[PDB]
């Protein structure tokens, strides 16, 4: 079912001059992203942090501290030059975790295999007053 | 002697400097 | 986490989805449309509570919701 | 030729190498401070760092005081200086009390420029920053006491 | 009188204000050329101003402590002057804006781009009905006799 | 990890993060033995968190009280109190 | 590679057919408006020519007509000027007696009363007195009789005629293309050489033969009317030969380059004319003549079209270091294919250029009556701060619609602006750290000064007499300036102004012209302040400027266009992130800045400065000397500034004054009225329309173009437009009605 792609270190990263927009503390203690696509030629791409950086021909693999801007840059990879691209996040521990996308289809194109999460079957005017549901821990929207 | 020479300093200077320094502490550490 | 929900109300136009920044909907089957098609949130842990979804939500009212609640450091989108 | 560079030649950490930050001798220079000693016991580095600190604060708190004026400015400004020095060490103990705890180990890092292991700085323990603000304190009372001692107590031309 | 005020005309303060401001811009017809065109301006003005006090004296109107015309509108008829027939005169003014407002507004709602016809007016269709507001308060009370001034199913 | 091109591995997560201390000595203490052995004996009863703390708090809150009450006249006017005979208000006084 | 004129004929037909079409360039405005937002968003977008299409060629060509029209706008505008001087003024009375009529071109119609404003200017005329120093103008140029402003008016409208048939014609019937605009060599070489070379040397012409004969009979003491008319001074020639004997040689000496004997009327004095109070004439002519010269000289660096020359691209690429890479390398593609860098680049140096010139003009008065004008000095001082903060701001603004929409290193790549994106947070970081400091030890120094003197302790406060800040700089700088005329500029008999010292006071008709300005503490402490303000503003720009793109906060900014309300209340809350923004908040610490700046000058200026003086040579100030020893503390301002300042403007009622104190109270007013717009939400006003809009339902009279709530945009463009106004307006006010009523 979709073996995620593994990380594979030694892939080389774009050539860049380096930035103050980079990594911090919360990458040495808590986590980062990291982020790979394949690059037909070697070109270049503007940074989801700083400047413009060349993204090699062969293995281009990007270590960005926000999930949110590893999702701009693959956005911009994937529609402004036509290139598949997967990210991950890494633990301080040295556990990688697969991320996106998550099972091997993007999430824009309906696939057989994923199942429902946070559906509500009525329309959003049919939520009880918060009065029924006050006293217990229960949200009303989360019913 | 004169009593406001004693109260006003402390509760001015030091009773703030103490009730800070253990709120803070009380405020900024897990349990 | 912020808590996003789905209402049968949604017409799975997928717009919502391909608005999110974070990756946290998605499309999977159903049978109460003529797509065959309803949006799901199975990575509200990553929400960062934008709600360009609900801007992209075509339906009156919407069929996409989202709730803010309890902040993380990934819900305030903190990269320090 | 080039002279900024990324960090240790890593172009995705958010910093970069130049000449203030990275040049030789402001490197040795910041390395051979007391807060970057890092395999000296701490009560020691606090010694250092609270006498220089504490010789300081006497120099603008008389010559700036309400009391510059009058006889007792000298003895006005250096206990304002000790109060002042006693109210760091509160921040100092305060701080060293909430951000760490005995069982628990060195938050310093423990890499080298070079890659290579080192011991972590003790400083970031528990009693290893108690160990560095007890030494701050005695230096720094002992700071604003040399420095009181040197003028006023002792003609000395000074100005 | 009403209000403890008494009658511009036999007032004291009126007439004191009414002799200082003439007084004030005699001078400043002084210093200049008997005849010139700025000091016949200023006798002009001066003449206007003569005009407006004994205007005033003569409508009737009441002065308090200070001199000045005070307006009464509660109701007295010796006062209707002053408030009730322009108040009068006003709503019949802002009666026919409004009514012949809503009567275009009502015309152009059929077609199928009316907002074409509310950023670029059809000045032919309003000034066929700019003076139906002449009789705007006949049309507007038959309109709710019938019924049809207020939308229902709302 | 540094191999020509690449910065990412696995293995030394904190190498990859920058988990470096740029201006740490790691050399031994400067100051002479003789001098530390004076030092640390003498400040030693100072480390104690909870005694440091309560002890300055309690030392400097009874410092302030005693400088404060027994001040004299020349260093605070508030204490020196008045020296000339009091106006009177609009009307009162 | 040669350059030529290239053209296109009638790209577009002059035609009624897009009047009749509301929006016509937006296509989704073309098609008509659903609701009332449609309307503000017509208005907002009009001339965004580079959203209206792609086309550089179309946006280009869009561009020079609008410059057409508004030049047509400037010259209609100078020709009333003209027009109601000559008309509508007391011009003649004036010149017969500069220092006791009171300058006035503009009369008002009795209509409601209002006759009250054509207050006693003097010279039998009842009238506005007005403050734009026209007056001035019209005499240094040796206007004299008002057919002569006729004149200029009527030329000034045929020029304005002229301007819009080009407009017109280059538009519709024969519009330049791209190849032609893209050439800047050229361009710069004629604007150099031909416009300001050329306009310089012909303004010299005009100063040599006219103003100067003209003016020295004026100062003479000649009727106005009995001096000769300018033309003769060209035919007959011995005429300026008795006035400049060296007139007689005739340009033989410009040939000979025996220029000695030009001495006469080509000076180099420096300093006031003690008799008119103003530069000397003989000094401005020789000024434009070697400013002519320097421009001609000047407008021949750049090739075009015979070999020599400077190509702009080689300059710029030969510019590199070992601190900046390839630097330089990228700009000039850059500069030649995006209005906005070339607009944010010419608005910064305008708004620089406007300020210096108000510092210049206040400093060494160039006009004659002009310095001991003193509502004219403070009105034009004020004007033109105002306006090079303005423009300073669009300079910013622009420059941040440069870097969201035409910003491009897959296409258009240079070094320099990528390294600086590269370290922006180091930028913003230590600019940060300099507003904070200074914030502190200007203003902390201000709060300080007024503890210590309400606790009744002034010898511990930052003053002249308790604790000395001097600014020793600017002190050493101007006894070096004092000094220079004989010592340092040898050929300079006064120095350059006279505010830098020497004594040397120059009065007129009993007023004080200018006197040496002295810098104590106050001026150190006030400076401080306005370094504090420009670097927060500037803070605020080019932090708004440098993260236009992206942040750590939002890490695909620019997809969101360059102006939007937010992206959302995530990741905390993300209101006003956008580019467009920081411009919003820049024009309300440059408000601030110029305030302040404005204040500082004039009670200086009524503090040191101006004054009356008399028969000993007693100078009695506005103000003796009250900002030395007032103006260090905030209460000093309040109370020895605003509310002593503030009573003229407030007695102003019941004279010809009265519009000043109508204007005041209206500035408050409208100022006030702003807020409604900066402190709310769409939301709460969307939320009562919709009831409003029940209530119109209820009666069938509801419109059909839905009415919305404005945009969150738009709200705070009101509200800050809206804020700018009440707030300069009243200053204007407070400062017209104060000086008008005690200079
Ligand atoms: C002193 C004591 C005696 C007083 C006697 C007073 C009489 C009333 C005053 C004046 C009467 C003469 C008016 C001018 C002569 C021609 C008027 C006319 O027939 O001009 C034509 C119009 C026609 O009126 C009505 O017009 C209505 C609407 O037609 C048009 O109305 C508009 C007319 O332009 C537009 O064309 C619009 O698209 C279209 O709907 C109705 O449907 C009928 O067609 C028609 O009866 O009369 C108009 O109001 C013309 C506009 C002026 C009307 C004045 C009414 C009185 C005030
Ligand atoms: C709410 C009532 C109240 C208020 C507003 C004040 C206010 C003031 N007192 Mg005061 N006081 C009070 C009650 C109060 N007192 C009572 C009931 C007593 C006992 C009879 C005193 C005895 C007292 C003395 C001896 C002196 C003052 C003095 C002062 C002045 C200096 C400030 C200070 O030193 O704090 C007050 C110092 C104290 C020792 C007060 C302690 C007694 C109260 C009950 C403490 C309450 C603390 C409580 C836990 C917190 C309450 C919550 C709330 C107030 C936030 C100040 C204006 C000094 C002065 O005269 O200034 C010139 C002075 O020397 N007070
Ligand atoms: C057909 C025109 C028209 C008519 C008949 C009415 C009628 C009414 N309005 Mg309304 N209004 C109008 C236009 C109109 N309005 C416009 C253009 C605006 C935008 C400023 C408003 C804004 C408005 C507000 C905010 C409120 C009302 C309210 C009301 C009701 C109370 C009266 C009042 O206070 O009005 C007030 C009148 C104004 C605020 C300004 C009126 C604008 C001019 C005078 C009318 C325009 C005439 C039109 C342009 C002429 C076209 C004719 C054609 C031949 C070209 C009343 C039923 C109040 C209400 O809700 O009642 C409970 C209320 O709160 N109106
Ligand atoms: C920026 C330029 C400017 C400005 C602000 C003014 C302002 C003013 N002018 Mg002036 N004027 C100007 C340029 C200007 N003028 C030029 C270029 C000329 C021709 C050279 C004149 C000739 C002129 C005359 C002869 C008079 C004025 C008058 C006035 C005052 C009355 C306003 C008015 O027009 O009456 C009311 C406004 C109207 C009646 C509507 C104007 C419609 C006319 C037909 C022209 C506009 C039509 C437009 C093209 C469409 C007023 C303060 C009058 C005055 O000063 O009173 C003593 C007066 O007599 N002006
Ligand atoms: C000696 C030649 C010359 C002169 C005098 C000017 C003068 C001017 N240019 Mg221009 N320009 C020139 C050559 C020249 N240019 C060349 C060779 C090019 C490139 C091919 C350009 C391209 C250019 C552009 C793109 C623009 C200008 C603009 C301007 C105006 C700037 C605004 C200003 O300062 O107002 C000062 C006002 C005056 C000096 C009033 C007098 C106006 C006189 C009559 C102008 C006549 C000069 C003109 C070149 C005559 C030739 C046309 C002829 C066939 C009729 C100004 C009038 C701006 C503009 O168009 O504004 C509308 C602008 O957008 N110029
Ligand atoms: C563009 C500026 C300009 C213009 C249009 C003129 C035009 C003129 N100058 Mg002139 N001049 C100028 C600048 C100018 N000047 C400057 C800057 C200086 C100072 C160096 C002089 C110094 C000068 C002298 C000394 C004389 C003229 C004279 C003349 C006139 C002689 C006619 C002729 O043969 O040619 C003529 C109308 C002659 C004259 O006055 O004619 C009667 C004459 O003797 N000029
Ligand atoms: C040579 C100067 C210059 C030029 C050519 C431009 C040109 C442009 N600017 Mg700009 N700008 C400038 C200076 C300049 N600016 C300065 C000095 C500032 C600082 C305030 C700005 C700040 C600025 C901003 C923030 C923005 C622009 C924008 C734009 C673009 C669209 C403008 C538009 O159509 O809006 C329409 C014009 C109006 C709606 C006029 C508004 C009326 C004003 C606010 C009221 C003025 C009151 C009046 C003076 C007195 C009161 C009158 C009343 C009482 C009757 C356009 C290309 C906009 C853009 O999106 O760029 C792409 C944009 O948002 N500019
Ligand atoms: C650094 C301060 C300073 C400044 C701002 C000036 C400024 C000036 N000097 Mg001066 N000078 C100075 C220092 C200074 N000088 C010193 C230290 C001496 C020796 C004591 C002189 C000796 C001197 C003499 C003898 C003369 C001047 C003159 C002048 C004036 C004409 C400038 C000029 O010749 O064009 C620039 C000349 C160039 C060749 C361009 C080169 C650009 C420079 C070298 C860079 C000018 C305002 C002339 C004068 O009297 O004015 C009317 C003149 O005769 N100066
Ligand atoms: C002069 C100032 C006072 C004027 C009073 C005028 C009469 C007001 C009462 C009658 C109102 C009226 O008939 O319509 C009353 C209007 C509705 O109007 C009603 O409409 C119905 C359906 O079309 C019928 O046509 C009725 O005849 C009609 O009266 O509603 C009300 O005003 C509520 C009051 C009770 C009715
Ligand atoms: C008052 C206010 C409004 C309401 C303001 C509105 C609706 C503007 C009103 C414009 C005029 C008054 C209405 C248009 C009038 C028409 C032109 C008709 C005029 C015809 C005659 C009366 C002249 C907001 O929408 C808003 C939005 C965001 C923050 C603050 C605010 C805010 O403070
Ligand atoms: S709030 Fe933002 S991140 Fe969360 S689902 Fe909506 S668009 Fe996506
Ligand atoms: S935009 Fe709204 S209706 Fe469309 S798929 Fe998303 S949630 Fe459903």
Redesign the interface.
């Known amino acids: 079912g979709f073996t995620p792609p593994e990380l594979d270190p030694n892939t080389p990263s774009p050539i860049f001059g380096g930035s103050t927009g980079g990594l911090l503390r919360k990458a040495q203690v808590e986590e980062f992203y990291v982020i790979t696509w394949e690059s037909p030629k070697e070109q270049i791409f503007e940074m989801p942090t700083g400047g413009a950086a060349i993204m090699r021909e062969g293995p281009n693999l990007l270590k960005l501290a926000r999930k949110e801007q590893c999702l701009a840059l693959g956005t911009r990879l994937r529609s402004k030059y036509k290139i598949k691209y997967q990210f991950y996040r890494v633990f301080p521990s040295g556990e990688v975790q697969y991320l996106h996308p998550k099972d091997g289809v993007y999430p824009e194109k309906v696939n057989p295999g994923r199942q429902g999460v946070g559906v509500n079957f009525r329309s959003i005017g049919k939520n009880v007053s918060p009065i029924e549901v006050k006293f217990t821990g229960k949200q009303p929207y989360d019913l | 002697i004169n009593l406001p020479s004693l109260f006003v300093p402390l509760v001015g200077l030091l009773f703030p400097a103490v009730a800070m320094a253990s709120l803070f502490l009380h405020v900024e550490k897990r349990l | 986490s912020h808590?996003?929900?789905?209402?049968?109300?949604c017409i799975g136009c997928?717009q919502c989805?391909?608005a999110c920044?974070?990756?946290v909907?998605?499309?999977?089957?159903?049978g109460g449309c003529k797509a065959?098609?309803?949006?799901?949130?199975?990575?509200?842990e990553?929400?960062?509570?934008?709600?360009?979804c609900?801007?992209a939500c075509p339906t009156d009212?919407?069929?996409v919701?989202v709730?803010?609640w309890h902040?993380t450091?990934?819900?305030?989108?903190?990269?320090? | 030729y080039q002279v900024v560079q990324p960090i240790n030649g890593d172009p995705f950490i958010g910093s970069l190498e130049t000449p203030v930050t990275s040049s030789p001798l402001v490197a040795w220079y910041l390395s051979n401070l007391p807060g970057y000693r890092t395999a000296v016991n701490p009560l020691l580095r606090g010694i250092e760092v609270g006498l220089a600190h504490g010789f300081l604060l006497v120099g603008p708190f008389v010559k700036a005081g309400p009391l510059r004026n009058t006889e007792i400015a000298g003895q006005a400004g250096s206990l304002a200086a000790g109060g002042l020095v006693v109210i760091l060490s509160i921040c100092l103990t305060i701080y060293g009390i909430s951000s760490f705890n005995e069982g628990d180990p060195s938050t310093a890092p423990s890499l080298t420029l070079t890659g290579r292991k080192k011991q972590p700085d003790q400083l970031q323990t528990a009693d290893g920053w108690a160990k560095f603000t007890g030494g701050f304190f005695f230096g720094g009372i002992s700071g604003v006491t040399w420095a009181f001692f040197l003028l006023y107590v002792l003609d000395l031309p000074y100005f | 009188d009403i209000a403890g005020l008494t009658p511009c005309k036999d007032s004291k303060q009126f007439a004191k204000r009414e002799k200082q401001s003439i007084k004030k811009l005699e001078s400043s017809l002084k210093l200049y050329a008997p005849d010139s065109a700025p000091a016949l301006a200023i006798n002009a003005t001066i003449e206007k101003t003569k005009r407006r006090f004994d205007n005033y004296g003569k409508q009737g109107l009441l002065c308090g402590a200070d001199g000045l015309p005070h307006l009464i509108v509660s109701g007295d008829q010796r006062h209707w002057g002053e408030f009730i027939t322009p108040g009068i005169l006003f709503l019949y003014i802002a009666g026919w804006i409004g009514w012949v407002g809503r009567s275009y507004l009502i015309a152009i709602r059929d077609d199928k781009k009316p907002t074409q016809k509310e950023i670029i007016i059809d000045v032919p269709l309003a000034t066929g009905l700019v003076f139906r507001g002449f009789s705007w308060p006949i049309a507007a009370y038959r309109e709710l006799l019938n019924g049809e001034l207020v939308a229902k199913d709302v | 990890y540094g191999d020509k091109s690449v910065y990412f591995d696995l293995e030394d997560l904190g190498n990859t993060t920058g988990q470096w201390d740029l201006y740490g000595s790691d050399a031994p203490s400067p100051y002479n033995s003789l001098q530390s052995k004076f030092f640390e004996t003498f400040a030693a009863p100072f480390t104690k968190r909870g005694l440091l703390l309560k002890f300055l708090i309690l030392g400097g809150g009874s410092t302030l009280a005693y400088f404060s009450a027994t001040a004299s006249g020349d260093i605070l006017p508030i204490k020196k109190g008045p020296q000339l005979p009091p106006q009177l208000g609009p009307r009162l006084g | 590679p040669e350059v030529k004129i290239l053209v296109d004929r009638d790209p577009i037909k002059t035609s009624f057919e897009q009047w009749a079409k509301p929006g016509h360039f937006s296509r989704t405005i073309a098609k008509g408006p659903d609701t009332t937002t449609w309307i503000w968003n017509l208005h907002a977008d009009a001339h965004d020519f580079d959203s209206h299409t792609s086309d550089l060629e179309e946006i280009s060509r869009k561009v020079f007509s609008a410059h057409f029209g508004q030049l047509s706008i400037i010259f209609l505008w100078l020709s009333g000027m003209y027009f109601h001087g000559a008309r509508f003024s007391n011009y003649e009375a004036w010149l017969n007696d500069p220092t006791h009529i009171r300058p006035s071109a503009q009369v008002v119609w009795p209509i409601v009363g209002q006759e009250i404003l054509n207050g006693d200017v003097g010279g039998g005329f009842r009238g506005i007195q007005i403050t734009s120093g026209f007056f001035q103008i019209w005499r240094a140029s040796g206007i004299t009789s008002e057919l002569q402003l006729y004149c200029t008016a009527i030329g000034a409208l045929v020029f304005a005629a002229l301007m819009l048939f080009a407009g017109w014609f280059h538009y519709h019937k024969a519009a330049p293309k791209l190849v032609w605009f893209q050439d800047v060599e050229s361009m710069l070489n004629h604007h150099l050489a031909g416009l300001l070379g050329l306009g310089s040397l012909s303004w010299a012409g005009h100063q040599v033969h006219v103003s100067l004969p003209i003016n020295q009979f004026l100062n003479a003491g000649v009727d106005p009317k009995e001096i000769p008319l300018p033309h003769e001074f060209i035919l007959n020639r011995d005429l300026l030969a008795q006035l400049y004997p060296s007139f007689a040689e005739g340009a033989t000496p410009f040939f000979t380059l025996n220029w000695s004997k030009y001495a006469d009327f080509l000076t180099f004095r420096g300093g006031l004319d003690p008799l008119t109070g103003g530069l000397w004439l003989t000094d401005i002519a020789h000024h434009h003549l070697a400013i002519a010269i320097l421009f001609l000289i000047a407008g021949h660096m750049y090739r075009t079209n015979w070999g020599i020359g400077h190509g702009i691209k080689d300059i710029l690429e030969a510019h590199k270091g070992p601190f900046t890479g390839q630097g330089h390398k990228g700009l000039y593609e850059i500069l030649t294919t995006s209005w906005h860098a070339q607009l944010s680049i010419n608005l910064a140096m305008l708004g620089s250029l406007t300020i210096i010139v108000a510092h210049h003009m206040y400093a060494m008065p160039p006009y004659p009556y002009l310095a001991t004008d003193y509502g004219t000095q403070l009105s034009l001082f004020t004007h033109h701060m105002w306006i090079g903060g303005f423009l300073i701001v669009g300079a910013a603004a622009h420059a941040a619609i440069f870097m969201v929409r035409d910003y491009d290193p897959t296409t258009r790549y240079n070094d320099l602006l990528d390294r600086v994106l590269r370290h922006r947070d180091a930028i913003i970081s230590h600019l940060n750290w300099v507003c904070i400091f200074l914030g502190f030890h200007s203003f902390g120094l201000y709060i300080h000064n007024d503890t210590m003197s309400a606790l009744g302790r002034p010898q511990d406060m930052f003053s002249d007499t308790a604790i000395q800040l001097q600014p020793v700089f600017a002190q050493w700088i101007q006894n070096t300036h004092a000094l220079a005329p004989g010592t340092t500029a040898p050929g300079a008999t006064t120095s350059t102004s006279l505010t830098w010292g020497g004594g040397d006071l120059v009065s007129v008709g009993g007023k004080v012209a200018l006197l040496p300005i002295p810098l104590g503490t106050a001026d150190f402490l006030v400076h401080h302040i306005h370094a504090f303000t420009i670097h927060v503003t500037v803070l605020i720009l080019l932090k708004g400027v440098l993260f236009a793109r992206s942040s750590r906060l939002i890490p695909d900014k620019a997809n969101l266009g360059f102006r939007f309300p937010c992206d959302g209340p995530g990741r905390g809350g993300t209101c006003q992130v956008s580019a467009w923004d920081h411009v919003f908040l820049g024009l309300f610490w440059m408000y601030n800045a110029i305030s302040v700046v404005i204040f500082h000058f004039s009670w200086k200026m009524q503090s040191d400065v101006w004054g009356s003086i008399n028969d000993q040579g007693v100078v009695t100030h506005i103000t003796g000397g009250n900002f030395a020893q007032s103006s260090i503390t905030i209460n000093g301002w309040l109370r020895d500034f605003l509310w002593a300042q503030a009573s003229q403007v407030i007695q102003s009622y019941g004279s010809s004054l009265s519009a000043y104190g109508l204007f005041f109270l209206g500035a408050h007013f409208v100022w006030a009225f702003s807020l409604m717009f900066l402190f709310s939400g769409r939301g709460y006003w969307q939320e009562l329309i919709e009831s409003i809009v029940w209530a119109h339902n209820k009666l069938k009279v509801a419109p059909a173009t839905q009415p919305r709530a404005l945009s969150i945009v738009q709200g705070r463009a009101v509200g800050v437009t809206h804020y700018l106004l009440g707030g300069i307006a009243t200053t204007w006010a407070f400062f017209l009605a104060r000086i008008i009523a005690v200079g």
């Open positions: 808590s996003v929900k789905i209402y049968d109300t997928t989805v391909r920044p974070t990756d909907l998605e499309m999977i089957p159903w065959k098609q309803i949006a799901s949130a199975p990575r509200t990553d929400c960062v509570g934008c709600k360009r609900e801007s009212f919407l069929s919701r709730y803010l902040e450091t990934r819900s305030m989108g903190l990269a320090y």
